[PDB]
Amino acid sequence: ICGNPVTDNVKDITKLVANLPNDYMITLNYVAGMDVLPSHCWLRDMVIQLSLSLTTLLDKFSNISEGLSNYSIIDKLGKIVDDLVLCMEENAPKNIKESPKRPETRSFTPEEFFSIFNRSIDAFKDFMVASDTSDCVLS
Amino acid sequence: ICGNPVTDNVKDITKLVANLPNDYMITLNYVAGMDVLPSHCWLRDMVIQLSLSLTTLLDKFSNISEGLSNYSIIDKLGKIVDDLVLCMEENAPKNIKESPKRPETRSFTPEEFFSIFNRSIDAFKDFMVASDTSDCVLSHHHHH
Amino acid sequence: PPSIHPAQSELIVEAGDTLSLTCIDPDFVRWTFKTYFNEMVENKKNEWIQEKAEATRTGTYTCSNSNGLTSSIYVFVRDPAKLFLVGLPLFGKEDSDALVRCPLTDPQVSQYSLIECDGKSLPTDLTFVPNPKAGITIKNVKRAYHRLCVRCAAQRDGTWLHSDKFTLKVREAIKAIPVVSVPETSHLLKKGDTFTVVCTIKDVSTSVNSMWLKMNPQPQHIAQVKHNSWHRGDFNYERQETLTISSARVDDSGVFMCYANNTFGSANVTTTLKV
Amino acid sequence: PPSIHPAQSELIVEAGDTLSLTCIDPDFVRWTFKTYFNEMVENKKNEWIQEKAEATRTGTYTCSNSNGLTSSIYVFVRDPAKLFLVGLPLFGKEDSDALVRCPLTDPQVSQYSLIECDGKSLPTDLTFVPNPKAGITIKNVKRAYHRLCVRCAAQRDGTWLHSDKFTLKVREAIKAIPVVSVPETSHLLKKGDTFTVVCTIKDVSTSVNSMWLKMNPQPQHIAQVKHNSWHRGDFNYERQETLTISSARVDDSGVFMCYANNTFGSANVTTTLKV
Ligand SMILES: *[C@@H]1O[C@H](CO)[C@@H](O[C@@H]2O[C@H](CO)[C@@H](O[C@H]3O[C@H](CO)[C@@H](O)[C@H](O)[C@@H]3O)[C@H](O)[C@H]2NC(C)=O)[C@H](O)[C@H]1NC(C)=O
Numbered sequence: 152i153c154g155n156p157v158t159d160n161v162k163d164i165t166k167l168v169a170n171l172p173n174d175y176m177i178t179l180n181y182v183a184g185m186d187v188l189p190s191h192c193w194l195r196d197m198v199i200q201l202s203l204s205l206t207t208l209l210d211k212f213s214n215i216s217e218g219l220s221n222y223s224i225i226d227k228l229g230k231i232v233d234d235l236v237l238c239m240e241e242n243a244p245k246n247i248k249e250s251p252k253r254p255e256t257r258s259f260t261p262e263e264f265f266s267i268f269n270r271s272i273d274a275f276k277d278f279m280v281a282s283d284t285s286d287c288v289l290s
Numbered sequence: 291i292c293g294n295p296v297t298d299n300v301k302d303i304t305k306l307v308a309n310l311p312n313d314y315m316i317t318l319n320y321v322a323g324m325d326v327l328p329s330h331c332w333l334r335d336m337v338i339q340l341s342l343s344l345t346t347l348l349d350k351f352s353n354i355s356e357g358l359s360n361y362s363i364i365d366k367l368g369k370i371v372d373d374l375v376l377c378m379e380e381n382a383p384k385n386i387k388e389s390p391k392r393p394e395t396r397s398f399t400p401e402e403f404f405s406i407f408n409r410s411i412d413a414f415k416d417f418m419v420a421s422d423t424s425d426c427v428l429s430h431h432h433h434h
Numbered sequence: 435p436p437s438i439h440p441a442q443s444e445l446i447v448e449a450g451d452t453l454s455l456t457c458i459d460p461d462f463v464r465w466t467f468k469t470y471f472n473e474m475v476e477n478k479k480n481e482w483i484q485e486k487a488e489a490t491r492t493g494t495y496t497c498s499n500s501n502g503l504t505s506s507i508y509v510f511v512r513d514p515a516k517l518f519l520v521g522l523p524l525f526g527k528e529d530s531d532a533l534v535r536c537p538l539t540d541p542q543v544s545q546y547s548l549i550e551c552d553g554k555s556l557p558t559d560l561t562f563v564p565n566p567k568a569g570i571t572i573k574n575v576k577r578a579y580h581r582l583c584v585r586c587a588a589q590r591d592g593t594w595l596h597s598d599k600f601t602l603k604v605r606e607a608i609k610a611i612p613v614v615s616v617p618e619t620s621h622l623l624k625k626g627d628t629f630t631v632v633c634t635i636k637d638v639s640t641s642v643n644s645m646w647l648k649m650n651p652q653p654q655h656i657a658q659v660k661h662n663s664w665h666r667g668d669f670n671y672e673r674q675e676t677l678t679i680s681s682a683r684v685d686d687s688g689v690f691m692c693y694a695n696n697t698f699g700s701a702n703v704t705t706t707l708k709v
Numbered sequence: 710p711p712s713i714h715p716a717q718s719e720l721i722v723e724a725g726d727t728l729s730l731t732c733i734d735p736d737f738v739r740w741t742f743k744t745y746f747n748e749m750v751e752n753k754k755n756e757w758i759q760e761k762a763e764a765t766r767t768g769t770y771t772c773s774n775s776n777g778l779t780s781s782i783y784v785f786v787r788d789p790a791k792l793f794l795v796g797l798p799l800f801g802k803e804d805s806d807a808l809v810r811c812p813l814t815d816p817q818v819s820q821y822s823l824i825e826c827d828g829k830s831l832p833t834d835l836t837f838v839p840n841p842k843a844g845i846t847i848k849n850v851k852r853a854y855h856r857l858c859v860r861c862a863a864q865r866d867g868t869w870l871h872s873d874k875f876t877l878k879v880r881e882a883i884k885a886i887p888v889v890s891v892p893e894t895s896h897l898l899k900k901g902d903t904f905t906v907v908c909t910i911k912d913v914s915t916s917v918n919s920m921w922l923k924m925n926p927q928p929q930h931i932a933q934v935k936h937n938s939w940h941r942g943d944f945n946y947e948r949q950e951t952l953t954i955s956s957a958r959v960d961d962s963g964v965f966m967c968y969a970n971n972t973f974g975s976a977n978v979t980t981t982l983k984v
């Protein structure tokens with residue numbers, strides 16, 4: 152029930168970042184331990200968070216014209232991550248006694264924020280047909 | 291010694307603003323009483339401040355390509371205001387006992403910040419060949 | 435079934451105050467609690483004490499039996515700061531429903547409804563159904579609601595209170611045939627020269643299956659194709675299938691078809707080559 | 710000559726402490742003080758008392774005489790928090806100097822120099838001259854320094870201290886003839902039809918004077934011209950002079966010249982019209 156979410160619109164990130172203030176903070180509820188733990192442990196959660204963040208981000212811009220505006224890019228990047236939320240919905244496990252502690256609210260620079268975006272995209276690409284049985288613990 | 295500072299690059303402000311977060315704060319030392327007092331009272335000071343702010347603003351972006359980027363526009367808008375600082379230097383009066391109190395440090399949204407930019411540009415256009423006999427007294431707040 | 439001491443279907447506890455549930459059963463196993471974000475909190479004790487109860491603990495609690503019986507009680511942990519529980523996105527399939535997850539922590543309020551997040555008017559045909567224990571459900575979702583932001587509203591002692599912005603994202607109910615197009619109808623060159631044909635597929639979702647064919651003896655499929663995709667608009671997806679063959683031969687000649695099929699129908703456009 | 714009681718060329722007072730200057734003269738007029746921002750603070754009293762002296766009061770104080778004589782004394786109001794006085798932009802003409810206005814409030818420091826604002830290396834041919842009473846002057850400014858950010862540094866008791874960012878903006882030394890260009894060399898139409906000619910002027914500054922001429926009996930100047938200007942790059946200014954004449958006639962015919970002159974030379978391009 153999931154087609155091809157990721158598009159070539161992700162190639163416009165470099166342009167987008169260079170067109171956003173490097174000191175502008177984007178709020179994103181970060182899942183503690185994302186760099187160390189394997190994809191499946193945080194992927195679903197992060198995609199939901201990116202979806203929320205990109206939605207809020209888009210609210211900060213206006214649609215001007217044809218030219219590749221920040222609004223344009225952000226809009227499309229939101230579409231991608233939105234589809235991923237539904238594509239992670241069908242693979243959502245049947246939860247039983249699991250309730251660590253919600254994502255920490257953090258703010259990142261555009262550069263940092265989309266680095267997280269890209270990682271999520273990559274972590275989704277190799278999520279399919281990949282060994283993930285590794286139970287998500289502290290290690 | 292002053293040519294034509296203002297260019298058509300100011301027409302890209304609308305685009306620029308729409309391409310900047312509406313909740314992004316730009317720091318600008320604001321001269322108290324700019325909306326009420328006449329141009330000559332704050333013009334020189336504001337132009338200097340805009341010059342500083344646009345310089346800092348540009349530092350926040352990177353030059354990507356040909357396409358009209360925020361870096362491109364901001365760069366050019368800085369050029370304009372920079373020339374105005376020198377064009378206000380030649381008309382700078384011979385100061386005698388004057389030290390009110392430096393500009394207040396404030397932060398504005400892109401929309402607000404460039405509204406101030408535009409007013410400064412306009413206030414410079416009609417600064418030339420204009421009677422600036424009006425006083426710099428706040429009490430005349432019923433607009434003057 | 436197990437017997438929960440606070441013998442009532444619904445319980446209103448104050449935020450900050452202690453919250454204790456107890457269920458008596460000889461064959462008791464564990465307590466179960468569904469979090470705002472679908473998660474199950476477990477407790478293997480008869481009595482569940484919650485000191486300084488937080489609004490997030492609002493929800494339904496279920497006492498589980500070893501025999502397979504269950505009994506539940508819904509608890510409202512009332513906090514004046516948090517009248518609505520937020521945190522999740524708003525999704526919804528076309529022609530289906532969309533639950534705006536904004537459950538309340540205070541059921542003693544009136545006019546629990548939806549309103550446009552900026553005070554504007556809601557679509558004429560937009561119909562919603564309130565539910566204190568889950569949120570507000572949007573009935574029959576249409577493509578025209580894509581990107582609608584809503585806020586849950588409720589009147590609390592005369593004054594109105596609003597929740598955070600909920601921006602609805604809708605899934606297109608694929609009910610149309612794809613759209614295929616190719617620049618040239620027929621073209622030919624001599625051997626050695628490489629040729630390239632770009633096929634353009636248009637549809638409302640990314641789910642479309644597109645492919646390039648080489649039909650001479652029978653429609654054969656080739657794997658050497660470059661994929662390119664873009665989101666042109668809300669329900670405007672576009673994929674460009676590029677067929678490239680290096681050093682053309684007598685073997686590489688004939689009619690090529692670009693096939694693309696939906697869960698609804700299918701489309702195809704053919705181009706001719708002779709080398 | 711006026712006699713200033715603090716009989717010393719330089720004085721180092723502490724910030725917060727009282728600062729008093731007194732000059733004795735039968736023909737005394739007023740005291741003068743240059744502010745960081747070129748302004749003259751005046752006092753018509755023999756003794757100038759400054760309670761709780763601020764770092765900003767650093768500078769040279771001059772006692773004025775009715776006969777026309779002057780006597781000055783430089784005062785340093787030491788502040789550990791504010792070592793450098795900062796607030797002004799950084800401008801400089803090409804092949805000239807550029808004063809980085811960052812005077813210090815503490816003369817008792819070593820290594821007072823300029824450094825790249827981000828810690829990088831300064832240009833190889835960049836030469837500067839330190840001056841505690843004014844700032845650090847950049848010698849022989851080039852176009853390659855345009856948009857260079859620098860910081861004033863000084864070692865205070867072993868530790869290093871930096872000032873705020875000073876981003877240099879350079880004025881072009883004009884040493885080239887303007888560049889003029891026109892699309893067509895010659896064109897003609899019948900009466901009534903309106904024609905437009907756009908002249909393109911290029912140069913390194915906005916100071917170029919450009920104009921449109923109508924030379925038949927003699928080079929005449931026309932005021933009906935639309936101005937358009939753009940900053941194409943660092944030293945790339947462009948102006949487009951548009952000549953428009955509504956309802957052409959027999960009177961409006963001949964050779965038109967686009968003249969543009971610098972402070973260096975001048976250029977011109979001619980076009981032909983016959984109606
Ligand atoms: C490529 O797309 C083509 C366009 O739809 C399609 O070609 C042929 O289309 C016709 C009409 O849509 C089909 O014939 C139908 O109608 C006839 C009466 O006119 C009936 O006898 C048939 O049973 C049928 O209902 C053809 O089936 C279809 N194929 C043919 C013969 O060319 C194709 O579906 C697509 N691929 C190709 C070229 O086969």
Ligand SMILES: *[C@@H]1O[C@H](CO)[C@@H](O[C@@H]2O[C@H](CO)[C@@H](O[C@H]3O[C@H](CO)[C@@H](O)[C@H](O)[C@@H]3O)[C@H](O)[C@H]2NC(C)=O)[C@H](O)[C@H]1NC(C)=O
Pocket residue numbers: 968975976977978
């Ligand atoms: C418009 O551009 C014209 C060319 O750049 C210029 O006109 C005259 O151009 C001639 C050469 O094309 C110059 O002639 C010089 O050399 C000849 C010898 O071959 C002699 O007449 C003199 O030595 C002369 O210096 C003219 O000097 C030059 N201008 C004159 C005086 O007619 C125009 O100057 C440009 N438009 C204007 C007048 O601003």
Ligand SMILES: *[C@@H]1O[C@H](CO[C@H]2O[C@@H](C)[C@@H](O)[C@@H](O)[C@@H]2O)[C@@H](O[C@@H]2O[C@H](CO)[C@@H](O)[C@H](O)[C@H]2NC(C)=O)[C@H](O)[C@H]1NC(C)=O
Pocket residue numbers: 643693695696697698
């Ligand atoms: C879109 O069509 C493909 C089928 O691809 C080809 O299958 C041939 C049998 C014939 O119908 C031809 O016209 C068509 O282009 C579906 O995908 C799968 O493709 C393989 C090819 O090896 C077939 O063997 C499968 O039967 C087929 N379906 C399965 C079981 O995956 C694809 O499903 C279809 N999209 C839909 C759902 O309409």
Ligand SMILES: *[C@@H]1O[C@H](CO[C@H]2O[C@@H](C)[C@@H](O)[C@@H](O)[C@@H]2O)[C@@H](O[C@@H]2O[C@H](CO)[C@@H](O)[C@H](O)[C@H]2NC(C)=O)[C@H](O)[C@H]1NC(C)=O
Pocket residue numbers: 918930968970971972
């Ligand atoms: C830049 O050019 C302008 C106008 O250019 C004309 O100047 C004439 C003197 C003559 O050389 C003619 O060929 C040329 O086209 C100069 O400005 C003034 O222009 C008026 C006419 O509009 C003349 O009457 C003035 O003499 C002239 N200068 C003065 C003294 O005002 C200008 O001098 C020249 N140089 C620059 C860059 O300023």
